[model samples]
Target: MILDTDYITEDGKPVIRIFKKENGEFKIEYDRTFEPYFYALLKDDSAIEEVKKITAERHGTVVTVKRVEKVQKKFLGRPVEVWKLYFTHPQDVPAIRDKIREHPAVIDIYEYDIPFAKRYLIDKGLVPMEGDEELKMLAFAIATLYHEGEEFAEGPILMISYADEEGARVITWKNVDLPYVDVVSTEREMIKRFLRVVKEKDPDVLITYNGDNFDFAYLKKRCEKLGINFALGRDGSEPKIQRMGDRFAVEVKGRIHFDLYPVIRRTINLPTYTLEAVYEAVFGQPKEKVYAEEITTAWETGENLERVARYSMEDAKVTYELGKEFLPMEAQLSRLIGQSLWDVSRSSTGNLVEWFLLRKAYERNELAPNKPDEKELARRRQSYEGGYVKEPERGLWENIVYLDFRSLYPSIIITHNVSPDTLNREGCKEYDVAPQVGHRFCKDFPGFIPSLLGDLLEERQKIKKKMKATIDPIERKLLDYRQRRIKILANSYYGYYGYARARWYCKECAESVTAWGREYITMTIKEIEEKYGFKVIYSDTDGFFATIPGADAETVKKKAMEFLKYINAKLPGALELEYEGFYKRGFFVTKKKYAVIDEEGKITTRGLEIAKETQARVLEALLKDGDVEKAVRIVKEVTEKLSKYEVPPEKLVIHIQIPHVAVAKRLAISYIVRAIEFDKYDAEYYIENQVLPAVERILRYRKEDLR
Candidate 1:
């Protein structure tokens, strides 16, 4: 591969360009090589003196001190100054790092080159295969045990997933006969033996679910009181108990102590993040017979010990399985963003996106912007007009067509060359300009965002093609998953532009994309209604429901394609409108809310709970039978049952996000399960109030339709 010299800057400073070919496409070689440095949070000026002495001792002898700079950052509740030392050679880093680490003057030391989190690696297109490779070599081990005490002060019931030398996966337990459960003499023996088992196995990864906050913390505290050594690290060192914010974690050096609970908490949003609930959600396997709350009572009563053992092992099994499923994806993302696997697994969407931009900036010789201060942050929050949403005609319609712009925001960005760096440039009118805001982008060359999204889109299209061609179910699913992940990251780029915390935040660029989106969708609606003889029943943001009454499905489909072709022809850059197929019939309640039955008998709902089991019967009566009275009767029946407390408690649960518990003046109906004894009648009051109103709305709509 050869360098694209046309794109390179002709600066006097030394510069290098490397190129490589991937999938028949020429691209610049990614920068995987990273230099080493140290971050020393100094105790005082004495720490800086030590650093200088160390550098002077080594300078021009074994290696050169490339540079020394004063760095300041917030550390542990206050601002502190530190000296950053850079070494000329990689070999010199460890020696200098180790020498300075033992100094009492050096309050804290970090090897800055190693990305502790995924956010540090975005853009380089480098993957850390070391972590994943190390992961595969390990004979994995998991233990789930808890102390049976009111405040957790006593004996532990243990369950170990012991894969012996013969590679047989067995569930070994203490005090049970299930072939794996063994009766330990006492709790002291259990703790002592458990430590010995871990030492002998020499596992690469120690798996746990909520063990950081509960299991490990409790065990560590118990071991400390009992004068027992919890030798879990490779060097026979004691487990490092660290407090991060409000949570406690056990960090074992030279071993991956992966707590699945933290990873899951970071990756997913759920009403309840209990091990049982998360396990069921991930693997569709619920724990049998025993719950966490009942375990202590079961132990005290000496009843169903085997059931308790099974429950403990089940959690371990779920944790191990989740690691297996997530590790590959984690590795994939880590490689894509050039970050550590551990960091990538626990990163947020915005953080991951920012890392990518950082890597891109590095390659392009662009300086990464610092995080905005509070005043600058406030300025970045200025609002702009969003997508166009047309008011809907209230009623059911036949032969409804749905059409939308493909990747609308992304296309608008690529076509208009919308990017932070390209905003408000010369010859602006010569390029596409956003309506109302008068924002313009470069047409001379592709901007950073456009190039990034274009590459992702191209990759996604290739993956989709592979998905379509693959015959194997497993392989297809894998490809589909990859494509979906790409789509998620790609779509996040537009909003990233507007995010105040983003490195490349541009209000005009983000606003312009939405501005263009509104124009495109509005243009699409007008063109279809006026030229194609179709009436738009509902429209919002990107897509719409429209109908050509009295036309057959085939005729409407053909007309929709022609309409799309006409619209695409008029659109600029990579912007293209696509047909989203015609629905059999549709009901348009209002903008951002509707339900439709497709030609294939599939029912679709948006911003409405039409297909929920509770609501389904009512919907069926109305849609399938065309019986308004039956639907009303069914709704009234459910409402009455709910009011009378005849329905299940889950049926009446409402999901309301708490703004601030400290500031909250009144409890919401949603808190009934958690605060059950507070007021049962209050729960019923809110439930009946909500349920009866919805039922009344249904009756009113039915009466209106009948008239």
Candidate 2:
């Protein structure tokens, strides 16, 4: 194992040093541990002296305060002032904290330390050692805490486990033969025992599913009731019940408590985000057949206690497996943005892009603008014209060529030098101009976002190459993950720039990017129809489908490449288009909506019930007979089944998102006009009446559109 050593700088600061050993491993050895402290302001200067005096009296020695700084931060539009106190020993935190609070001058007292991985990078100016061994050294682990409870009262059973990809264990309970299934006698015993297990594990990163909203919160509530110390942190500390925006986050010191739900929602698009659903989606296997509501029922039965225990253990297992998929991506993003993995994983698109810009801004000596206040956000809330979409021809067409610009918005930013720093600047004749908005950006120096995108694009290309070259499945998967993370981040920058809450919010930059995109796509479609004899069947923001009428398959493929060559010559900078694919037959319904059946019989779709049972049937029938009339008949057939209550329950199921206030009022009026009290009905009523009608309307609309 590689050893990493820590040392105290001459100024009494903490530093960790690591090196690669001959055995292809590394570790750290540290003499001084970094102890961070927080302080609440007292009456003034006198409070400082009183705190020092109290600390010395309590510790039985004159405490040496390394450094103190007044933190200037804001919370809820109000400026907050707190002092950061540094100490040498970890033990001094609680001692000083306890003594200082009684001094009357202290409002609040606590210790605040950055996450272990974050501190490691900040201190060393290097990426932390990677691999399972490194994680083990830092006590990196995954856990889930389960309890049987109701809305009315706390239940009498609790379970917690440290489960990994290899195996799961109920640390609170013990069993033979089933090494992972341990059982405790009482709920109180389970709570205390699991808390002790957390202390023993001392994980640097704790993984959980919906732990922010449920698992950790439940544990904290139960621990509070039982007077149990939930010491999950490395310093014998407990998770703090902190508010992260509108939601509760169980923030722990020294360790990163990463709740998976936020990251999962950010990454994956799914109808239901339950653990079982996510597991099935990712792993392609259904989770154990134990429902959440059945937990208490199983325990109450007593005969099914072992089954319930196994169910809880399975949940922890699923959570750990999900972490295996996401944690690597989060780690890569964290390193790329120079932020904590927890923060990077949990951050929204705007915040993640902002963090990347912030890092570059610091490096370039650029001052980031202050965060927009709520009033400013309101003032800036207005929509600009988005990407131009050509009205789709709406028909089944053959011999179609699909083409798109690579990284359209990102490429636009790079090509046009779209950045807040270069906005509205004159005396720069060498500039890229936006089509509709007439925004010009100076070409003298690279913009902050453009510079980052340039690098990110290059890095992604390199990763792609590595992914292609690697024969090992595991290595290729890792490379693919890295490439995808970079792509998502680079793509998010355009939207993030226009976001009102963006620290570097630039309307001009955002508008210019879209303007260029619209112009390029419009140029391509115009060229396809006017310059060439090809028919432009459909077009969207960045891509269009076209066919050279009466051309052979090989001839059409050659013409598609030649067309791309012509378009690339007319485009600017690295802004070039390419042929994405050639389809045997495809139907264009509307902008952002299409279905394509390729030569391989693969049906590709977008912006429709592409995966729905009815839509799938329609597309399949259309492909089978190569007739739009046949597809319409299939839809009508499904409609007939639904009207007669002949379709399966699952096939009839529909999902609806509630509309805005005005639209919702109109919907309610419709229901009220029919003598249906929609407001007084539950989800079941809406599913049967409102949802089914919405579904029927869509089916009829598609049928009418075809006609």
The Cα local distance difference test for each model comes to: 0.61, 0.64
TM-score of each: 0.70, 0.73
Q: Over all chains combined, what TM-score does candidate 2 have?
A: 0.73
Q: Which ten residues in a row have the lowest lDDT in candidate 2?
A: 136-145
For model 2, what is the alpha-carbon lDDT of residue 131?
41
**Regions of model 2 farther than 4 Å from truth:** 1-153, 171-180, 196-203, 288-293, 301-303, 383-388, 468-473, 610-615, 633-707
Name the regions of candidate 1 deviating beyond 4 angstroms. 1-65, 68-125, 129-174, 185-207, 226-269, 283-293, 374-391, 426-429, 468-478, 600-602, 610-614, 626-630, 633-707
lDDT of 1 at 92: 63
* Candidate 1 lDDT tens digits, 1-707: 22111111232111222322234333444222333456666677755755666642344555545677876643311245666676544446655665666677776564443432232233334444322123421223334444545566355544544333333233343456676554555666766666776776665556666666766666676778778888876657776776565767665554556667767886678888876678778878765546455766666666777676655555555667777666556555655655544445555677778777667655663445456667888777765535556778876576778887678888888878888757766654457678977987767766777888898898889989888878988668667666877877887888788777676778888778777787777787788788888878888877877878788878888777777778788887578777777676666665676667766655666345411455566555555454536766666575466656666665444445422463245443354434524335425455444544344433334432211
Root-mean-square deviation per candidate: 11.2, 10.2
lDDT by residue (650-686, candidate 2, tens digit) is 4222233323355566546222222333322223233
Model 2 alpha-carbon miss at residue 236, Å: 1.4
